């Protein structure tokens, strides 16, 4: 009654779990920065491991709806786990938050759909049209086989060859135990001007460690991608062959703004570890929830809280954001960054930025 319910579904076990662990984190971070009160509601959040299973994630939106009334929906660590609960959201007319989830269509699957994460298709764009720029001629692509994976693939690949680059082989390894030795091998001896990565949150050190084994840190092939292989919650794990990495992302540790000053200190302080980008779409969600009930005066029901998140602009960690009134998607600065060494450790230190991006696989 004086109680609004957030249901949390994201990845807290599992290969995604670094996914989970960082948005529920930033929310725990949020709400001890804001405190758990807004427009006279007690906001609670219920946090349930889906183990990126989008089986599970159906399951418990529909506990979480039905048995425990809460008002919003949020986290989907994958796109499947996002298109799982899509239905439910529709059928309850309860917000449905995406924190994680980055493939365009998303949002055009449920008009009760809000992202604060990313799509893939803003950040490929850009690193398609910096490489071709930039002197790389020929691309091997690598990258995660499902939804995300393929969204950068043809974003990456139609900037790219516009710009008169060339794509000379496309591999794809699972989203579960992906091995990249295979890969890897074939750069060895294909050696490309480049090779394009996508992985998502969670396995990029991995990849970098079969990389640094092969020695392609000395084969002269650059490594560029969307953000995702470059996530900043493991880039503190990982050794000098990431050195020199260029990627395109909406969020680095390293923005150098005010706000992302403070919330990187704030989050190290608490948890011990560097936010990576998983974390900031977390912390902006819920700044949406809290911010969308303020603008409705507490009002709780699915309408009002949409017609209040369309529009709403802030400023975020990331920098300038907002949500696009008529797709209910993220928009966003995306940077372009270098991996460098600053006081010991590796960061994606921004270099480029192109202002408020709205999502190209919807324009």
């Given at each position: 009654e004086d109680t609004f319910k957030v249901g949390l579904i994201v990845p807290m076990t599992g290969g995604q779990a670094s996914t989970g662990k960082q948005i529920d984190n930033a929310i725990k971070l949020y709400i001890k920065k804001h405190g758990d009160t807004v427009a006279g509601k007690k906001i609670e959040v219920i946090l349930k491991d889906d183990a990126a299973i989008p089986d599970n994630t159906k399951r418990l939106a529909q506990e979480l709806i039905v048995n425990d009334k809460v008002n919003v929906i949020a986290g989907f660590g994958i796109t499947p786990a996002a298109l799982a609960a899509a239905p439910l959201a529709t059928q309850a007319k309860v917000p449905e938050i995406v924190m994680a989830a980055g493939t365009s269509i998303i949002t055009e699957r449920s008009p009760y759909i809000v992202r604060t994460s990313f799509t893939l298709a803003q950040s490929s764009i850009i690193i398609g049209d910096w490489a071709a720029k930039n002197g790389i001629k020929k691309v091997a692509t690598l990258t995660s086989d499902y939804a995300p994976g393929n969204d950068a693939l043809a974003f990456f690949k139609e900037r790219f060859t516009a710009g008169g680059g060339e794509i000379?082989?496309?591999?794809?390894?699972?989203?579960?135990?992906?091995?990249?030795?295979?890969?890897?091998?074939?750069?060895?001896?294909?050696?490309?001007?480049?090779?394009?990565?996508?992985?998502?949150?969670?396995?990029?050190?991995?990849?970098?460690?079969?990389?640094?084994?092969?020695?392609?840190?000395?084969?002269?092939?650059?490594?560029?991608?969307?953000?995702?292989?470059?996530?900043?919650?493991?880039?503190?794990?990982?050794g000098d062959a990431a050195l020199g990495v260029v990627t395109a992302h909406m969020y680095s540790a390293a923005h150098p703004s005010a706000m992302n000053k403070e919330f990187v200190a704030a989050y190290k302080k608490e948890f011990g570890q560097r936010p990576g980008f998983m974390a900031v779409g977390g912390y902006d969600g819920i700044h949406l929830v809290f911010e969308a009930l303020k603008k409705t005066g507490g009002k709780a029901d699915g309408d009002s809280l949409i017609a209040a998140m369309k529009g709403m602009k802030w400023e975020s960690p990331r920098g300038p954001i907002s949500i696009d009134p008529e797709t209910r998607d993220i928009v966003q600065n995306i940077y372009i960054r270098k991996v460098e060494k600053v006081d010991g450790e590796l960061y994606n230190i921004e270099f480029a930025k192109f202002d408020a991006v709205k999502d190209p696989g919807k324009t």
């Open positions: 000379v082989e496309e591999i794809k390894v699972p989203l579960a135990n992906p091995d990249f030795a295979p890969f890897l091998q074939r750069m060895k001896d294909a050696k490309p001007d480049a090779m394009f990565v996508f992985v998502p949150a969670g396995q990029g050190g991995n990849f970098m460690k079969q990389f640094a084994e092969r020695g392609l840190d000395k084969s002269g092939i650059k490594v560029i991608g969307p953000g995702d292989v470059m996530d900043d919650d493991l880039l503190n794990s990982m």
